Write a protein that binds this ligand. Structure first.
Ligand SMILES: OC[C@H]1O[C@H](O[C@H]2[C@H](O)[C@@H](O)[C@@H](O)O[C@@H]2CO)[C@H](O)[C@@H](O)[C@@H]1O
Ligand SMILES: OC[C@H]1O[C@H](O[C@H]2[C@H](O)[C@@H](O)[C@@H](O)O[C@@H]2CO)[C@H](O)[C@@H](O)[C@@H]1O
Ligand SMILES: OC[C@H]1O[C@H](O)[C@H](O)[C@@H](O)[C@@H]1O
Ligand SMILES: OC[C@H]1O[C@H](O)[C@H](O)[C@@H](O)[C@@H]1O
Lengths: 636, 636
């Protein structure tokens, strides 16, 4: 058993030399073998790894923890997610730390340590994650990432070079005798033993510009002449609306001169251009895309939004997969015969403009990616990205295969529109991402959340921030909102509390400027901060474990614990909205008992019925006076 | 002849495919083979390289341009520097550009291009440099750099891993058939043909933490126990002044408990610790320092200032060379017998606290580094860094060897104190760095420059900014000072006009926060600027060639040209200071003629005698009225 094999190894390597730095919050209460200098602590990584793996292994019964927890629990439905508390993480960032204990962070240092996040360090953090009250860890893509077309010194986890392989960088040199796939398997075993479920992330529609799939399936990709790389951009039609074009608009679009030049930038796959040349390079050493560019003078194109007139820039680190062998049915009557496969708004949203010939071999591969993870490591659920673009038949196959192996498997839709819950449910999903963080961060918008949640037909991840948005600690009235926002949000109907990595220590710097973000957030840190201006998605970044917001850390732990103490109300009580202009408020009544969630977002204090009151601490008073930006849970 | 060999190769590879992006300012007037899209231009790198090398080769006579220009001119003195105009550059930055023409910069891209600066691109820029009026190019260290203990994704040019080798990264993959040493030699040949002198930079006192010199001379370095790495810092003595300690202070220092713990952190070289082990690893593959740390558990220490109580942080990317075999003479009576070699304020300034046993073999090596460059590539001069710390005998040997080979060779002292000119001259130097940029950027300080320059006994580099200071374009009243400051400065007595790379296009972002810098300068660029927050010394950085300050570019060219038109006055005219509170002014009289340099830094306009007046343009008026922050050169 790998987790035990790793424990055995650590005990073997133990030496007592404390030269590996970790922030004090990473040291568990039971661990005493460490030196403390300058705020941080030093340990023998093997003693820390041995004692924490012991702590974990001692709680194991004698089942096989390499399969989904649902198996050990005998569950046949994804109902468990409704009682879970999720911690979201980009392992590379969550577990990054300068182990030298001085100077600047380095991906790998002279002492032999990998300061970047590893699956082994994610294991060491398990006691910390568990202390937050989380019982499910959601991870951003950990598949092999492409190192081409990067925006910084680190690749985006969404630039997937191989869906079936984990990125070797998650391997930790401390565990030389082990392989990355084994470290991950061990990581999931440790989670399962602790009752923690694992949810991964996949993006079927796209691939890295130099995807490993190119050598054996060069025809599953699109190609353009290198000469056309520099000015390759989505052809605009300013007279038309900013949106995904409909059928009628296509006729207009296809007659525009700029679209016609666009269509002419494409070529046939390298295998169909020079069969002999292909075979030659196809079996050559070096980056496959660099070989194709040099030998054939063609390259995969960068991706771009499927909405016409979208002002966002092209996605240079990814490209689209060829979902159909033929061009979209409704567009064929506008193409010159012999038109090679091309990318345009319609081809991207295959769900709306499909061809008559599905690329079955690709479809099968795609529908076998998650099951490969369920069977190999026993993951418990997954988030599917860009599902809007997938044909219904391909999405159905993908879900059938995972549910076939484990009917308790939770499928999470990357659906930000909380009004699209009905459609997501109809698509086969079990949970929706939603956009609660947008309202939770605005005093003038937070009161809309109660009705929004109540109307859902699927549970949602109740977040106050995600990897793509600004941190809650940087929103207006942050000092108050960093506690008020999660309180109101985590208690909503149909909620699955979500804790974003770093949120628990009041992290300010955003990880990415994706959704609802302002470039000025790039400068919330001090110009003297080693990580000033850096975005975790594209650059090496270490969260501020050495200077955490302890007030937020403590409140979050207590909030999750109290919320769980009353979980039965949230899940089965009768809900009633009591929100007013100045007061966001609602209640849950059950078996004659009732709890009330309240938060004052007005300019003047307000009073409400008392009883036993919680606001971080428990008190008892008949009346509760909520000054502006104060809140409380009232138990009557 | 390498320059011709490279020209031959470019013509061979020429194909006419324009996919290599360069900013329009890089295209010479004579070059027409380029496409222009989105502000930037695209070329076939081989056609650009062929036509520019042709342009250069066509101006060559039939001499050997691989030796110093002084040889071809028959000069026996370094007098030429007094008539020169210097362009200062960090090739890695000056010649960096995203050749894909879209997306984000990459050290090396999928098209096969090296976007980082290369000696081949420095050759292509030669027509541009020449258009500025510069006739000498000064380069920051281009020796092989260490990749350990970096502050960003790029190494500091001062982290010298091998003084005798050029860093392989300056090689350009376009010239596959050539070696880096050949590209550099060719670069210097092209400069010499164009009349441009080459000045390099060396730092004898220090070395990278993992210097290549370690395998054969592990004993030329200091060593400390890894266990002591994290808290290794210069022992403070707050009761003592912030300065380099004198003799008396040493007795106190050596009796402090913290200094005593410091002394105990050191060990003997790995060769003296385990002779057999050394021989084993000494012949192993891998980073020599990583092997030593793992096998012996010791490491070279990071450097630090020789001034006690200095608030600056340790220099983790460099370490000190062992200049003496014994401990400093004046400190021996304070050491425990068997004290291994250690680093302390006194050991660092070997010039002040020397031992009785010079490390002759090291001294010889050091004194052979520059001559290796003179003989191999024919460089014309050099700047020596940290000369304050070198024993007089070692500095004398170093200068004797270069002067022995070429008596016209120019030695530049890294001396910022313009009052230390007499001492620098007495040390054997020919030029001093000085600190004019500090006064030139302050309206309340600029008037002191005239007397300061006049008193010099050696010429100085008249700069308004250097790689270590803020850009002149970010000082107060920048829009005016970016032209007024260089005007006043370039005409000073004993001046050698200095143009900092990027200054010519009004660059704002600093390259380094070294001298006189404020961390807030780190944010002068837009948060949307791809290079926001980056410092060229430690990170990949591309100057803003695509959005240059054309007004500054033009003025600088005209200023250097007019200054040279009157060079005889500056060099041989009689100087007279005429500066007042509100008016910085001075004159040069020669052969009955006189020119006057004037700049109004007051709050009210001022009038002065006219004649033929230059202020960017030539005019003729009997009286000149200088409003605040206006200037003029008056020819009477
Ligand atoms: O490298 C692809 C893409 O990654 C990021 O965007 C992600 C986003 O964070 C996910 O939540 C999901 O929506 O997929 C997106 C891309 O598929 C970066 O923000 C983006 O710049 C980058 O191109
Ligand atoms: O890596 C050494 C050091 O390099 C830089 O400082 C240079 C400085 O720029 C030079 O002008 C000269 O004074 O030598 C210095 C170091 O020898 C960086 O500023 C510094 O952080 C770094 O440690
Ligand atoms: O399966 C992908 C898509 O299916 C449905 O269209 C849902 O409305 C949407 O939320 C989901 O992303
Ligand atoms: O040779 C190194 C040093 O020599 C003299 O001390 C000079 O005063 C100083 O400017 C120089 O740096």
């Amino acid at each position: 058993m790998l987790l035990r094999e790793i424990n055995r190894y650590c005990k073997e390597k133990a030496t007592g030399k404390r030269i590996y730095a970790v922030p004090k919050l990473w040291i568990p209460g039971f661990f005493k073998k460490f030196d403390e200098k300058s705020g941080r602590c030093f340990v023998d990584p093997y003693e820390l790894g041995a004692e924490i793996t012991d702590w974990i292994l001692n709680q194991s019964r004698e089942w096989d923890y390499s399969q989904p927890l649902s198996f050990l629990k005998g569950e046949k439905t994804p109902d468990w997610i409704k009682r879970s508390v999720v911690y979201g993480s980009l392992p590379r960032t969550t577990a990054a730390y300068n182990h030298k204990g001085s100077g600047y962070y380095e991906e790998n240092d002279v002492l032999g340590f990998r300061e970047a996040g590893t699956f082994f360090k994610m294991m060491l953090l398990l006691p910390f994650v568990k202390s937050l009250g989380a019982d499910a860890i959601y991870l951003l893509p950990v598949s092999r990432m492409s190192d081409l077309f990067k925006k910084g010194d680190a690749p985006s986890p969404y630039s997937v070079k191989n869906p079936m392989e984990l990125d070797e960088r998650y391997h930790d040199p401390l565990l030389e005798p082990f392989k990355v796939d084994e470290e991950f398997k061990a990581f999931v075993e440790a989670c399962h033993i602790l009752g923690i479920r694992v949810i991964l992330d996949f993006i079927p529609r796209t691939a890295a510009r130099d995807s490993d799939l190119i050598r054996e399936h060069p025809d599953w990709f699109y190609w353009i002449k290198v000469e056309e790389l520099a000015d390759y951009t989505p052809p605009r039609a300013e007279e038309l609306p900013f949106k995904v074009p409909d059928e009628d608009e296509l006729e207009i679009i296809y007659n525009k001169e700029n679209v016609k030049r666009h269509l002419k930038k494409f070529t046939l796959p390298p295998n169909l251009i020079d069969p002999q040349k292909w075979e030659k390079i196809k079996r050559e050493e070096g980056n496959i895309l660099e070989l194709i560019v040099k030998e054939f003078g063609i390259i995969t194109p960068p991706g771009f939004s499927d909405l016409i007139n979208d002002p966002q820039p092209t996605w240079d680190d990814v490209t689209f997969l060829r979902l159909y062998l033929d061009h979209p049915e409704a567009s064929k009557r506008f193409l010159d015969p012999n038109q090679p496969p091309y990318v345009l708004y319609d081809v991207i949203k295959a769900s709306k403009f499909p061809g008559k010939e599905p690329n079955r071999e690709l479809w099968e591969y795609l529908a076998g990616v998650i099951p490969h993870y369920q069977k190999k490591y026993g993951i418990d659920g997954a988030r599917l990205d860009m599902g809007h673009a997938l044909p219904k038949e391909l999405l159905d196959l993908i879900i059938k295969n995972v549910k076939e192996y484990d009917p308790a498997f939770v499928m999470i839709a990357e659906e930000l529109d909380m009004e699209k819950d009905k459609a997501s449910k109809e698509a086969g999903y079990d949970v929706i991402l939603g956009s609660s963080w947008y309202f939770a961060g605005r005093v003038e918008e937070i009161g809309k959340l109660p009705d929004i949640a109540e109307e859902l037909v699927l549970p949602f991840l109740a977040s106050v921030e995600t990897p793509d948005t600004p941190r809650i600690a940087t929103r207006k009235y942050a000092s108050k909102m960093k506690k008020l926002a999660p309180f109101v949000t985590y208690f909503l109907p149909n909620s699955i509390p979500y804790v974003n990595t770093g949120q628990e220590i009041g992290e300010k710097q955003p990880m990415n400027l994706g959704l609802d973000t302002d470039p000025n957030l790039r400068k919330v840190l001090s110009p003297t901060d080693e990580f000033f201006g850096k975005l975790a998605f594209f650059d090496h970044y270490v969260l501020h474990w050495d200077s955490p917001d302890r007030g937020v850390l403590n409140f979050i732990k207590k909030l999750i614990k109290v919320r769980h103490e009353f979980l039965d109300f949230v899940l089965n009580g009768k809900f009633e909205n009591l929100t007013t202009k100045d007061l966001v408020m609602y209640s849950y009544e059950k078996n004659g008992q009732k709890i009330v969630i309240a938060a004052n977002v007005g300019k003047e204090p307000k009073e409400i019925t008392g009883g036993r009151v919680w606001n971080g601490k428990w008190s008892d008073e008949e009346k509760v006076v909520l000054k502006p930006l104060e809140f409380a849970l009232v138990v009557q």
